Amino acid sequence: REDWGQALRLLLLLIEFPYLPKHYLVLLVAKFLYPIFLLDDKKLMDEDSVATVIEVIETKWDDADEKSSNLYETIIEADKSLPSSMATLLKNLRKKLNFKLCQAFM
Amino acid sequence: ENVECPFYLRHNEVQEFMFAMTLFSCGNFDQSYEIFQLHDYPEAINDKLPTFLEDLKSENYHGDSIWKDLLCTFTVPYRHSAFYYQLSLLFDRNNSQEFALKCISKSAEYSLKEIQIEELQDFKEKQHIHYLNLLIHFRMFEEVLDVLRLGHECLSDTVRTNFLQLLLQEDIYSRDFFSTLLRLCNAHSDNGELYLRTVDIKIVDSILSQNLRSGDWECFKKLYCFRMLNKSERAAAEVLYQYILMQADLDVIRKRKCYLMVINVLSSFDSAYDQWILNGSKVVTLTDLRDELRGL
Amino acid sequence: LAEMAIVTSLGPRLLLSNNPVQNNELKTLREILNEFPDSERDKWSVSINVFEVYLKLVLDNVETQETIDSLISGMKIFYDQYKHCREVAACCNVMSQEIVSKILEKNNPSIGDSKAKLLELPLGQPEKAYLRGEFAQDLMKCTYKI
DSSP states (O other): OOOHHHHHHHHHHHHTSTTOOSSTTHHHIIIIIIIIIISSOOOOOOHHHHHHHHHHHHHHOSOOSHHHHHHHHHHHHHSOSSOSSTTTHHHHHHHHHHHHHHHHHO | OOSTTTSOOTTOHHHHHHHHHHHHHTTOHHHHHHHHTTOOHHHHSOSOOOHHHHHHHTTOOOSSOSSHHHHGGGTSTTHHHHHHHHHHHHHHHTTOHHHHHHHHHHHHHHHHHTTSSOOOHHHHHHHHHHHHHHHHHHTOHHHHHHHHHSOSSSSOHHHHHHHHHHHHHOHHHHHHHHHHHHHHHHHHHTTTSOSSOHHHHHHHHHHHHTTOSSOOHHHHHHHHHHHHHTTOHHHHHHHHHHHHHHOSSSOHHHHHHHHHHHHHHHHSOOSSSSSEEEETTEEEEHHHHHHHHHOO | OTTHHHHSSSOOSTTTSSOTTTOTTHHHHHHTSSSSOSSSGGGTOSSHHHHHHHHHHHTTTOOOHHHHHHHHHHHHHHHTTSSSSTTHHHHHHHHHHHHHHHHHTTOOOOOHHHHHHHHHSOOOHHHHHHHHHHHHHHHHHHTTOO
16 A cells, blocks of 8 residues: 555564564565565664664574574575575665664764 | 947947946846856957956056956956956855856866966965855755865865865754765765765864764764765774763663664674774773673 | 783784874884894794884885885784784784875885785775775866866
8 A cells, every 4th residue: 555654563563572483583574574674765764773673683583493594595595685694684784774874864 | 228228239349348247237147147158258359458447457446346356357367267257256246146156167167178278276276165155055065075076186175174164063054064965975885986085084074073072972973974974884883882981971771772783783794803893992892892781 | 932922912002002193102112122132133023023024114114115015925924813812903903004004105106016915915994995985086086177
């Protein structure tokens, strides 16, 4: 409905519930959050708004399971839209975050 | 109405000058500009001109005249450039900055050609200064940037320091200017370059530290975004880090936010010498930084 | 033994905390090797020596192309075993910033090979971005005057 502002809001609300452990998180970011909403710039962020985003990644997402990481990678290869290594995915997120942030302050 | 319109002699020296001023004082600055575009007089009619204007061409007239200054540029060997400049000065003074802005663009085109024609350096500075003012007045800040930048053989870098200081240090100007500059950096950041040269970068970088004086977040954020866009990110984190340290009147929640950004930026670098920020002269590790957020 | 205590346990503080403005601490480093044996110099200097060639080139201004090369090739090795020792690593970056700066300051020889030299001595985060940035502006300035 091209109500991209509110679309983001509902997805965030669902993720905040701590019943997701690390693989019902891997699925969401590659399907929705990263390709649709953070590859496109259209949002003004600031130092704190970026920080909070830093909090979510560091605490609750990353694969600790060896099978989960190897599986995410095969899936990434078949359908490419996100950096293949996930320590290069750390880098790529930070850069998009920093664009949003810069644009508010200029 | 009575003189310069029934008795316009077309491409005659006398009726061209008389008309051209008369329209100008009647506030038709567009029509005056049209007349100099029907002949650029230093070439078309050369520098021979009437006895009473000759007095103006020199300093042998002692009354009221601002057009005096326009006759003066028929003595100089950079005569095309000087002429148009004088027209720029004239328009700006009677408040018709649009038409001044037209004149100095031609004046500048003329100055660049006239570098194989002998043209004084002191002249050049003042002429280019006049151009920057017009652009600043309408706030067309993109063009201000080009003229300084490519114009290092036109000005001294110190006069340039003042101009960037003026827009950086004046609040009337600072938000609108900073935004125009940083947009252009971002476009070029993408491309593999910097929009600015390294000489320009340090002049600005210096101008923004004057602000800092007792910490203060706003001072820091301006120097932080500056560092961020020139891909000086490691150094951008050092500026963040100081906000934390320099103030002990910050809330725990304020501190925690800064640490997170400093932690994340170094951890996205994966090297052996970009895993630290410098605090003074003391090496502060990524491990020590994380412990500092954990200690909160 | 005393070579080992500045290079394997705590990088010189006369090349880290030294003030760059007048370089007063940096030349204390230099002068106290003039108080330490020079009658038997080339048997105990191999970490300390890198410091010596560095100091003569920058302090006393002995800018020779050969001198520059000798230090850079040696300093690649040197960087390659104490880029992971604490403190020492942070000092190497200072050294590199100084040498790069010093070449413009005496006239850049502007040959292919010395362009090469600048990149063969390790660079920082702002530096690699600056070079690419400046080279397009410089081209622009040339085409500027009619």
